[PDB]
Design a protein around this ligand. Structure first.
Ligand SMILES: Cc1cc(C(=O)N[C@@H](CC(=O)N2CCC[C@@H]2c2ccccc2)C(=O)N[C@@H](C)C(=O)NCc2ccc(F)cc2F)no1
Ligand SMILES: Cc1cc(C(=O)N[C@@H](CC(=O)N2CCC[C@@H]2c2ccccc2)C(=O)N[C@@H](C)C(=O)NCc2ccc(F)cc2F)no1
Ligand SMILES: Cc1cc(C(=O)N[C@@H](CC(=O)N2CCC[C@@H]2c2ccccc2)C(=O)N[C@@H](C)C(=O)NCc2ccc(F)cc2F)no1
Ligand SMILES: Cc1cc(C(=O)N[C@@H](CC(=O)N2CCC[C@@H]2c2ccccc2)C(=O)N[C@@H](C)C(=O)NCc2ccc(F)cc2F)no1
Lengths: 223, 215, 217, 217, 223, 222, 215, 222
C-alpha cells in the first residue's frame, strides 16, 4: 500500500492506491483505501485489509456518534486522540500480524486563517501521533519512495489542483518502486482514489480527473 | 397494584401536560419539527440517524437520556449491520420497549412524550413516517402530523383544519406555528428543524436565526 | 397475596378488553390470521418458524417482546437440533410457562393474549393446530378458530354459526371480517396473513394491498 | 408514588430555602460569583475547567459531592478527547441527568442548587453562559444573572432593576453585595471570577486586602 | 475444494465440486458445499468440513432470524458484514487448523441497475471482505486454476446458460490440476452442484443439466 | 478397533470387534463397542475406551431425555446434530490423546421410502458428520481394510442375513490385516457383536448366528 | 420522607444529649482536648495524623468506627502522595461526606459528633483550625472552641465568657474544666496537639502530669 | 533524545532536543519533549513517543485535578511520588519495549531558602526517584555526554541566562556525540526547546533566545 497526504493553501488532499496482495499474489485491483471519515476529515490506512476497513468504519461511526450526542463536532485534537487510542488498542493484534497504520488528513474549521487550516497527522503502531508541519506525509510499503518524491515535487503545490497532481505523481513513484503498491491501470481504467478537503468540506475527486493527471504523468515520463 | 399504576399514569400525564408543546408534520420536502423552546442551547429536537429524527416534550433530562439511548441504538445497529438497515420503525419500536420498562419498573416514570420521524433516502419515493411513543410505551402510527406536550387537543384540531398534504416549507411552518399558538411567537422562543429528504446523506438540518426569521 | 393476584388478573383483563380484536381460523389451505389494525407498519401477526405462526392482542410492546422471545426460542431449538423438531406445541408450551412467570413475578402483568398456529409440512396431511395462551399462562387447544382481544362473545358467536371446515381462502376471509365487524372494515384497517400449507418451506405469507382487496370483493 | 416524590420535592425545597444565598452575574470581564459565606476554609464557589466555574447553595457535603463529580467529569472528558471539547453546556447537562437520578433514586434528595458558568476562551468574542440546575434535575440557561438559596425573589428583584450589561468589576461586585443585602464585609463573603482575559485558567478568587479594595476602592 | 461464482446479465451463478479428503485419502464423493443461504444469496465454503457446514447453517439461520425479528431482510451490505464477523470470530481456531473461507453470491433486490444487480463477495481468514467488480471469483485449493480458466472464458458469458457452462468448465480445470478438487464422476453420475440466482430468487440447478454440461466439456476436450 | 455398518433392503446392520489394547498389549477380549442408543439407532465408537463409553452412554441418555421432555423423539437429523456436537465438544481432549470417533446406524421412521429408510452417518474429530450414500461404511484402525472388503462383497447383500454375513466377513478381513482389531476367538467362544435395525426397531443379533457365520467364513478360506 | 428523616435526626440528637461532653480549645501552644471520660481504656480523643487530632461525643462503637476510618483515610492519602498533603480541612470534608451517607442510608443514624483539629507544622506560624461535624454531615469552621455532646449551651456560654486567646496550658485547661462543670484525673481524658513537637503533635496528659497541671 | 535540567541562583531550567527516530530513519524534526506540567514544574521525557506524550498529558491532568478537588496544589514530594507511581505502572510495557523515562524540574514555593528552591529529580524504569543535589542532570541516549559537558561548564552558571546557555551547550554536545539527539538545524530554523522556572513561575523560553545562544556556540567552536 501507499497513502499520501499533503497541505495546499486552502485545504488538504489525500490519495491512495488500489492494490491488494497475499504474498506476491495480487488479490485486489479496485480497493478503496481512503475514506471520508467526516465532513472535514479523511483517513487512509495501510496494513491488514480487514483491520484497516474496520478502523475506518468504527472511527467514522465514533466521530458522528459524539457529534449527535453533544450537538457539536469534536475538536481536531480530539479526533487525533480518538484515532491514536484506537491504534494503541490494536497493538496486540498488530504484533500477532493484524497490523494497520492510519494517516489522517483534515481541515480545522477552528484554525485562525483558512489557508493553513489543513492538518496532516501520522501514527505508529503504539498509538503515537505527529502533526506534520512540513506539508506532506505518506504511509505504507511505498511511503519512503512517495515521501522522497514529494520532497522534490512539493514546491509545485500552489492550490488544490496542483496538490492532487503531486499526490498522484507521488503514488506513481511509489508504485514504480514498490510491488505492493499498485500503479495506474490504463487497460482496466482503474486509478488511485483521492479526497480533497477545504472550507466547503471533504469531497471525493472524480475518477476522470485522476485519470487525466495519470495520463499526463505517464506521457511525460515516456516522451 | 392498580392504584400504583394509576398514580404513575397520573404523575406522567400531569408532567407532560405541564410542559411546552411540540409539533411534527410531513411536508413536500420531508418532515418539519417545530417546538416551543425559550432556551438558546438546550434542545428538544434532535437527529438520530441519516434519515431519522427525534422530537420530545416533557422533563428535559429524561427525554435527553432517551435521546442519547436512541442514538446509541442507531449507531450500534448501523455498525453491526449496515447503515441502511437502521429504520424509524426500529427506533420507535425500541422506544416502545424502553418506555414500557421504565413506566412499570423505574422509581418514577418518565414524564416524556416522544416522536420518531423518517424521510426517504436521496432519490427514493417514500412517504414520510411519523411515530409517537407515550410515557407508558404506547406507540401510534400517524400519516400527517404529531402533537406532543401541554394541551394537545386544541393544537391537534387546528392542524386537522389547516393541514394539507405536500405543503411547502413556508406553508407548513406557518400552519404549525398557528397550531402551536392555538394552545397556549417568534424566533427567540422557537426551535425549528427539518428532515430534508433532498439532502444526499444526513437529512436532519436546523433552521435558526436569520434563516428562520425569513419564514 | 390473594387480593394482589386478583388485582393483576383484573388489570390484565381490562387491558386486553380495551384492545382491538384478532381472529385465527383453519381453512382448506392452512390457517388464516385476520386482525383489526389501522397501522401501516406495526404488526400483530407474525411468523415464528417454517410452519408456525403467531398472533397477539393487547399492549403492543408487551406482545412484541413475547413475539421476539418466541422467535429466539424457535431459532435456537431449530439450530441446536433440526428444523423439523420445532413444533407449534413447543412454542405454545414455552409461552404458557413464560406468561405464568410474567403474570406472577413482574412489576405489572402483561396485558396480552397469544395464539400459536401450525400447518402441515409440504406434501403431508395433518389438520392445522391452534393454541391459545392467556395473560396468566393458561393454554387451550382449539380445533377450528381462536378469538382474542376486545369483546370476544359477539365474534366467537358469529364464527360459531358461520364457520365451516375446509372453506376457501376468500370464504374464510369473509367469515372473519364479518365476525370481527360484529363485535366491534377494509384494507386500510386490516392486517391479514396466512399459514399456507401448500408452500414448500416458509408457510407464512402476508396478504396486502391489491391482493387483499382482490380477496375482499 | 406521588406522596414520595412531592415529599422529596418539599424536603429539598425547604432545605435550600434555609441555606445562605449565592449570586452569579456576567460582567464586561467575564463572570462574577458572590456568595454569603463566613467560613475561612469551606468554599461554595469553585473552578471546574479552564473557562468553566461552579457555584452552589444548600447542603455543603452534597454540593461538594457534586462539585467533585463535576471535576471528575471535566478532567476525564478533557483527557479522553481534548480540553476544548469540555463545555459549560456539557457540565450543566450532566448535572441535570445526575440530579434527576439523585432526586428520584437516592435515599434522601440532595438539598442543593447549582450554577455552571462558562466564559470565552482567551482572545475570542463569546457572550458568557450561565446555567441553573435545581434539585430535581430541572435545567435552565439565563443570559444575565443567577440566584440560588434562601429567599430568591428579593435578590432576583434587586438585580432585575439594577443589572446593567458590561458592568465594571467593582460595579458588578457593588450591585452583587447590594442585591444580596436585600436577602456584609470581607469576613462574610466568598468572591471569585471567571476572568475571560486570563490566558489559560479563567478562575480567580478575590480575597483579603484585594477584595477590600475592590469593595470601596 | 473449488468454489466458483460469476455474474451474468441479470443474475449470478455459483458451483462447487463434490470431493472430501483426509490428506491423500478420498473420504467423500457427493459432498454439498454450495448452500442457498437465503432467497437471494448462496454461500460456498472451502476448508475444514465441520466448520464450513456450521458456517452455512449458522449464517442462514442468522439472516432469517433478522428477517423475522425486524419484518424485513438485511441489506446486502449487512449480510456481507455478518458473514465477515462470523469468519473473523473463527480466526484463532482457523490458525489452529480449523480454517474455513466462504464465497458469497447474491442478487441485490435494492440495486439501482437491475442488469448488474448480481454480487460476488470474497473473504479471508481475518474477516476481510471484498465485493468483486471483475465479474467472477473462486475460493479453495483449486481457486487459482478456476480463476485463470474463467479469465480466458468469461467473454463467452452472455446469459444464464453460458455462465453456468463457464462455471462448470472452471470447476473442470480446477479438478484437472488440483487433486483435492473432484472432477465429474461419470461412472457414479456425481457432478458439481450449482445454484443460480436472478430476480426470481435462488434455485438449485438440476443434476442432469450439470451432467449434460460436463459431457459437453469432456467431448470438447477429447476431440 | 473396527466398526462396520451397511444398508440392506429395508434395514441396516452394524457390527464391531471385541479387542482392547494398551500399546501392543491386549487389555480386553470381550469389549462391546456397538450400543443400541435408541429404539431405531445404534452407535459404534472407536478410540479411547473411556471416551467411547461416555459417548454411547451420554448420547442415549440425551435422546431419551428429549423424547420424555417433548413427548416425541428427535428427527434423525437432530440425532446426527447432537452426536456431532458431542464429538466437537471433545476436540481439545482428543488433541491431547483422548480421541474417540462414533459411527451411527439407524432406521428413519420418517423416511419417504421404507426400503431406503436405512441411515449410516460417519463423523470426524472436529464434529464433522457425513451421511453415507454408497451403502456401507466403517470406522477405526481397521476401517480401510473392512471398507475395501465390503467394496468387493457388497453386491452379495440382498437381505438381512446376507448383510450380516458381509459385515462379519468385513470385520474378519479387518482383524486379518490390523493387529488392533480382534478376530473370532474360537478357543474362548467370543465373537463380534452386531445389531440389526429395521421397521420393527433395533435388536441385538444373537451370538449363535454370528458364531455360525464366522465358522463358515473360516472354513471357506481353508 | 421528611418524617423518616426527622425521626432519624431526633434519634441522633437525643442519643448525643445522653452522652458525656467534650471541649476543644485553641491555645498558645496548640490545641487542647478535654473530655469527660471515666473509663480506664476507652478513648474519645485520638490522634489522626502528624498535626491533626480527633475528638468525639456520643455512642462509642460508632465514633470509634469513624475514628478508624479517618486514620485509614489519612495514612492512605499520605502514602499515595506526601505526609504534608494531609490536612485537617480534608479529614473534616471526608467526615462530613461519610456522616451524610450514614445519616441518609444506614439502618440507624450514628449518634456521634466529631471535632477535627489541626495545629501548625513545627516552626511554622498558623492559627489552629477547629472543625465540627454533626450527625447529619453538617460541618462548621470554628476559631476558638467547639463543644460536643450532652447539653452544650451551658458549656458554650461558660467559654464565651471565660475564653482568652493564646491562653497557656494551665489556664486553658482550667477554663476547660470550668466550662465542663457548668471533675478530676479519675474522670477526665485530656490530650493536646502540641505545635512545639517536631512531627507527631498529639500528646496525652495522664496521671501524675494530669493532676500536676490541676493545681 | 537528550533532556537536561540545571539549577541556577533562584530557579531551574530544562531543555530538550527535537529529534524523533524509527531506528536509523529520522521520523521527526520538531518534537516538543519538554512540557510545562504545572505553574511551577516542567517534565521532559525520553523513550517511546506515544508513552512520553501520554505521561506528560496525564501527569499534568493529575496535578491540576488534585488542585481543583482539594483547593490547594500537591507538595513537591507528592508530585514526585505521583510521577514515580505512573512510571512504575508502565514497567511491564517498558519490559516489552514501551520504555519512557521522565526528568522533573521544579521550583518549590514551600522551600525555606528562596535561592535554593530549585529541584531536579531523575527516575528509573522501576519508578525509583532521586533528588539531584549536585546542580544538574540529564536523561536519554545522550544524557552521559551532556552530563559530562555540564560537569565542566557548570561553574559558569550565575544567573538564568548563563544557565540557559550552559543547557543549550550541553544539548549541543549530546547531539555532537549521539545520532539519536538532534542538533540545531540552521537550514530549517529549529532549535531545542527550553522551560525556565523561578519564583514567578514556569514559562517557555522564546525560540529566538535559544537561536542566538546556539549560534554563539556554533561560531565559538568554528
Ligand atoms: C490473518 C490473515 C491475513 C490475511 C490477508 O492477507 N488479507 C489480505 C486481503 C485479501 O487478500 N482479501 C481477499 C478477499 C478479502 C480480502 C480483501 C479485503 C479488502 C480488499 C481486498 C481484499 C490483506 O490484507 N493484504 C494486505 C497485504 C493488503 O493488500 N492491504 C491493502 C489494503 C489496505 C487498506 C485497505 F482498506 C484495504 C486493503 F486491501 N488473511 O488472513
Ligand atoms: C480436527 C479434524 C479435522 C478433520 C478432517 O480433516 N475432516 C475431513 C472430513 C472427513 O474426513 N469426514 C469424514 C466423516 C465426516 C467428515 C465429513 C464431513 C462432511 C463431508 C464429508 C466428510 C475434512 O474436513 N476434509 C477437508 C479437507 C475437506 O475435504 N473439505 C471439503 C468440504 C468443503 C465444504 C464443505 F461444506 C464440506 C467439505 F467436506 N478431522 O479432525
Ligand atoms: C490416558 C489413558 C489412555 C488409556 C488407554 O489407552 N486405555 C485403554 C483401555 C484399557 O486398557 N483399560 C483397562 C481397564 C479399563 C480400560 C478398558 C475400558 C473399556 C474396555 C476395556 C478396557 C484404551 O482406551 N484402549 C483403546 C485403544 C481401545 O482399545 N479402544 C477399544 C474400545 C472401543 C470402544 C469402546 F466402547 C471400548 C473400547 F475398549 N488409559 O489412560
Ligand atoms: C511499538 C512501536 C514503537 C514505535 C516507534 O518507534 N515510534 C517512534 C515515533 C515515530 O516514528 N512516529 C511516527 C508517527 C507518530 C510517531 C511520533 C510521535 C511523536 C513524535 C514524532 C513521531 C518513536 O517512538 N521513536 C522514539 C525512539 C523517539 O524518537 N523518542 C523521542 C521522543 C521523546 C519524547 C517525546 F515526547 C516524543 C518523542 F518523539 N512504533 O510502534
Amino acid at each position: 500500500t501507499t497513502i499520501v497526504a499533503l497541505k495546499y493553501p486552502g485545504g488538504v488532499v489525500m490519495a491512495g492506491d488500489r492494490r491488494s496482495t497475499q504474498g506476491n499474489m495480487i488479490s485486489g485491483r479496485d480497493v478503496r483505501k481512503v475514506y471520508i471519515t467526516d465532513d472535514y476529515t479523511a483517513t487512509g490506512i495501510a496494513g491488514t485489509a480487514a483491520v484497516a476497513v474496520e478502523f475506518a468504519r468504527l472511527y467514522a461511526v465514533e466521530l458522528e456518534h459524539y457529534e449527535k450526542l453533544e450537538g457539536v463536532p469534536l475538536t481536531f485534537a480530539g479526533k487525533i486522540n480518538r484515532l491514536a487510542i484506537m491504534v494503541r488498542g490494536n497493538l496486540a493484534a498488530a504484533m500477532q500480524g493484524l497490523l494497520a497504520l492510519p494517516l489522517l488528513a483534515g481541515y480545522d474549521i477552528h484554525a485562525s486563517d483558512p489557508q493553513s487550516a489543513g492538518r496532516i497527522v501520522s501514527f505508529d503502531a503504539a498509538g503515537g501521533w505527529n502533526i506534520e508541519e512540513e506539508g506532506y506525509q505518506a504511509v505504507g510499503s511505498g511511503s519512503l519512495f512517495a515521501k522522497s518524491s514529494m520532497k522534490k515535487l512539493y514546491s509545485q503545490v500552489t492550490d488544490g489542483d496542483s496538490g492532487l497532481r503531486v499526490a498522484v505523481e507521488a503514488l506513481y513513484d511509489a508504485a514504480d518502486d514498490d510491488s505492493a503498491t499498485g500503479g495506474p491501470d490504463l487497460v482496466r481504467g482503474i486509478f488511485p482514489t483521492a479526497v480533497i478537503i477545504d472550507a466547503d468540506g471533504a469531497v471525493d475527486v472524480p475518477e476522470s480527473r485522476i485519470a487525466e493527471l495519470a495520463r499526463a504523468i505517464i506521457e511525460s515520463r515516456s516522451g | 397494584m392498580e392504584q400504583a399504576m394509576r398514580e404513575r399514569s397520573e404523575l406522567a400525564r400531569k408532567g407532560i401536560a405541564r410542559a411546552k408543546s411540540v409539533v411534527a408534520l410531513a411536508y413536500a420536502g420531508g418532515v418539519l419539527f417545530v417546538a416551543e423552546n425559550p432556551s438558546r442551547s438546550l434542545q428538544k429536537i434532535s437527529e438520530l440517524y441519516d434519515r431519522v429524527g427525534f422530537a420530545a416534550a416533557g422533563k428535559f433530562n429524561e427525554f435527553d437520556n432517551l435521546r442519547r439511548g436512541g442514538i446509541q441504538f442507531a449507531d450500534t445497529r448501523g455498525y453491526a449491520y449496515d447503515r441502511r438497515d437502521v429504520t424509524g420503525r426500529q427506533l420507535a419500536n425500541v422506544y416502545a420497549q424502553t418506555l414500557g420498562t421504565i413506566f412499570t419498573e423505574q422509581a418514577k416514570p418518565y414524564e416524556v412524550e416522544l416522536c420518531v420521524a423518517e424521510v426517504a433516502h436521496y432519490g427514493e419515493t417514500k412517504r414520510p413516517e411519523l411515530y409517537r411513543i407515550t410515557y407508558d410505551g404506547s406507540i401510534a402510527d400517524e400519516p400527517h402530523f404529531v402533537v406532543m406536550g401541554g394541551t394537545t387537543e386544541p393544537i391537534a384540531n387546528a392542524l386537522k383544519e389547516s393541514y394539507a398534504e405536500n405543503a411547502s416549507l413556508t406553508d407548513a411552518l406557518r400552519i404549525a406555528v398557528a397550531a402551536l399558538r392555538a394552545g397556549s411567537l417568534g424566533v427567540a422562543s422557537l426551535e425549528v428543524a427539518v428532515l430534508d429528504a433532498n439532502r444526499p446523506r444526513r437529512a436532519f438540518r436546523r433552521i435558526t436565526g436569520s434563516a428562520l426569521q425569513a419564514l
